[PDB]
């Protein structure tokens, strides 16, 4: 949801210009900079955790109640709040103001039978002079006393000056007070009291808040940040702290390499004219190009070379499934907590910095800690095969042949091509060339 | 119903060099960011510079980069422009319209131009 | 460079005129977000249409934005004597890293 130049208070309260998203049910409220209000000044004390908690319900989903005031005037309105040409106030508020000559401590009862939880968002009016005060509220003294079966809550205006805006000197204090089901709910004002028209439908959802001005383009992305929905293939970010949905860890790191492919001694000996066909040891084949590991033969037929499948394919297989076990594929996560602000508030603000700052840096750890374990666990595995690989020959070959060292073992007898695809298999038999073989060798 | 005050037309001889001011009223202009464009006499527009209140961030044209360069009092709600040795072609028409673009966007592009000011004009020449 | 648009365009009355302003594949591809501005005669420019057709407060519907491929157009309906003025298509690049401007067009009113 789009709540362009409206913030999710703005349009609970009910904003001329916010009007439009009256009723509105929503995933992620969007918050843009552009924002601003245009109505009766006001100001919302805890502000922060109230529209944390109505962007947790995701809907300002309104349901008027049948509110009787006695005694006094309702629909109060104001130049500050226009709705139209006409002079207005808040929606889902109720300005009430005294009746003809008197102010009728008003006092009356809404019973919560429903079985959700009821959200009513009242107000308190700070007059900016007495006169203002004793003509709109009559006696001098307001004073406002909500309360449920539960808790308690008593407001009292403070009559005096203070910093002009759109026009007036004068404020609103928001206050709000949840209604659990069965209980009920009690309004005792003296006056300057700023009554509802009714509640709020709270619902438990992954509905959440994010800050920022991007821009929003039809397509799917299961994460969201404030810098525009990114691909969660990887395991980590560095895009920003904030998230939203199935998101990568935000680790400091703003890269980090893991080790796919093998360890790689690139260069050859491309020892001369006559190939040498000299085994690995110091070089790796870039000829090669059907597998991870092969074997080259030099035999009288002449040169030649094969990959070996098996080999390759155990390294590979160990490989790919590796990262996502270590890994999470993902992790959800909706409503956190804000990771900035704009002011200084002392003591909670400090926390809750501390609390998000100190879980990246350990987390950032693991991420440099486990890839580092992975690239050094790879070398060695793919590394590995390649020896191993190399004694399944030795012990195959038998006597036959020796280790010239050099990673190749140099065959005592006459080997056709055929003779040493019977060896690559493994099929090959040592008794066969035993007695020719052992003549050569120490003769 | 956001008015721009720009400041007094003004006229330097090449070389010198001059600075453009430009006010807000009503949306806090800490809460948009801004953007020039010079109008040469009957010859189009033309961007120049880009800042983002409340954002520090700062974007010129690569033709007069170093030259030109942005600032923002934002406590005052009044951005400057500030433009040194100047050229005698340069002299034309300066605006600064409302912009978008700004926290998390960074970016100009999506933003599209609004509430552009009156305009001052500079003159250089020898 | 400046974006390849119509050096003028002039219709009857009450009519249709399409102004069409072509972009660079930095500019095409990317298709970011392309606004116009009308600049009355001797008078600071002002939003005409911005975000693809994203239109401004209390300037009227008759004024549309299309955009495809490598370029897009305004198109004007019922047009009428006080819609003549200087129309520019500005827009954004990256190639430049910057936005670019259109080249302008004169739009006058037949009669």
């Known amino acids: 949801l789009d709540g362009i130049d409206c913030t999710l208070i703005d349009a609970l309260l009910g904003d001329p210009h916010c009007d439009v998203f009256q009723n509105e049910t929503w995933d992620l409220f969007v918050e843009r900079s552009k924002a601003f209000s245009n109505c009766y000044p006001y100001d919302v004390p805890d502000y922060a955790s109230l529209r944390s908690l109505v962007a947790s319900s995701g809907t300002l989903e309104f349901i008027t109640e049948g509110f009787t005031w006695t005694g006094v005037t309702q629909n109060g309105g104001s130049n500050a709040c226009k709705r139209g040409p006409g002079s207005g106030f808040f929606s889902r508020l109720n300005w009430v103001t005294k009746s003809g000559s008197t102010y009728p401590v008003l006092n009356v009862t809404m019973p919560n039978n429903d079985n959700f939880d009821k959200l009513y968002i009242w107000g308190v009016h700070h007059p900016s002079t007495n006169q203002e005060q004793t003509s709109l509220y009559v006696q001098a003294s307001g004073r406002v006393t909500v309360s449920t079966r539960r808790s308690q809550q008593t407001i009292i205006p403070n009559i005096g000056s203070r910093p002009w805006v759109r026009g007036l000197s004068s404020r609103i204090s928001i206050y709000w007070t949840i209604v659990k089901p069965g209980d009920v709910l009690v309004i005792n004002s003296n006056g300057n009291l700023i009554a509802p028209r009714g509640y709020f439908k709270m619902r438990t959802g992954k509905s959440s808040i994010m800050r920022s001005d991007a821009p929003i383009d039809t397509c799917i992305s299961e994460c969201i940040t404030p810098n525009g929905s990114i691909p969660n293939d990887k395991p980590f970010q560095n895009v920003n702290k904030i998230t939203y949905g199935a998101c990568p860890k935000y680790v400091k790191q703003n890269t980090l390499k893991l080790a796919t492919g093998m360890r790689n001694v690139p260069e050859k000996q491309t020892r001369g004219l006559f190939g040498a066909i000299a085994g690995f040891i110091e070089n790796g084949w870039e000829g090669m190009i059907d597998g991870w590991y092969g074997f080259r033969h030099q035999n009288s037929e002449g040169t030649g070379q094969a990959a070996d499948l098996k080999s390759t394919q155990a390294a590979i297989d160990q490989i790919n499934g590796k990262l996502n076990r270590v890994i999470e594929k993902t992790n959800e996560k909706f409503h956190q907590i804000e990771k900035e602000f704009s002011e200084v508030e002392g003591r909670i603000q400090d926390l809750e910095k501390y609390v998000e700052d100190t879980k990246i840096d350990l987390w950032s750890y693991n991420a440099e800690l486990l890839v580092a374990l992975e690239n050094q666990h790879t070398i060695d595995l793919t590394d590995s095969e390649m020896n191993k690989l190399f004694e399944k020959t030795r012990r195959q070959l038998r006597e036959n042949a020796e280790d010239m060292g050099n990673g190749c073992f140099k065959i005592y007898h006459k080997c056709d091509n055929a003779c040493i695809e019977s060896i690559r298999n493994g099929t090959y038999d040592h008794d066969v060339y035993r007695d020719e073989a052992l003549n050569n060798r120490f003769q | 119903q956001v008015q721009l005050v720009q400041s007094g037309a003004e006229v330097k001889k090449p070389g010198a060099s001059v600075t453009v001011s430009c006010q807000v009223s009503?949306?806090?202009?800490?809460?948009?960011?801004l953007s020039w464009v010079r109008q040469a006499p009957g010859q189009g527009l033309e961007w120049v510079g880009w800042i983002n209140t409340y954002d520090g961030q700062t974007k010129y044209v690569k033709k007069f980069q170093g030259r030109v360069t942005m600032t923002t009092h934002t406590g005052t709600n009044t951005a400057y422009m500030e433009m040194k040795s100047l050229r005698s072609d340069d002299t034309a028409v300066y605006y600064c319209?409302?912009?978008?673009?700004?926290?998390?966007?960074?970016?100009?592009?999506?933003?599209?131009?609004?509430?552009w000011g009156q305009g001052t004009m500079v003159t250089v020449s020898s | 460079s400046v974006l390849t648009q119509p050096p003028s365009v002039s219709g009857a009355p009450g009519q249709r005129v399409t102004i069409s302003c072509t972009g660079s594949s930095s500019n095409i591809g990317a298709g970011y977000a392309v606004h116009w501005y009308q600049q009355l005669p001797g008078t600071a420019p002002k939003l005409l249409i911005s975000g693809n057709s994203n239109r401004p407060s209390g300037v009227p519907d008759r004024f549309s934005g299309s955009k495809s491929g490598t370029s897009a157009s305004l198109a004007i309906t019922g047009l009428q004597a006080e819609d003549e003025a200087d129309y520019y298509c500005?827009?954004?690049?990256?190639?430049?890293?910057?936005?670019?401007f259109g080249g302008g067009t004169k739009l006058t009113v037949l009669g």
């Open positions: 319209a409302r912009v978008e673009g700004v926290r998390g966007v960074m970016g100009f592009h999506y933003y599209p131009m609004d509430v």
């Open positions: 500005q827009s954004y690049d990256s190639s430049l890293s910057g936005s670019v």
């Open positions: 009503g949306y806090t202009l800490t809460s948009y960011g």
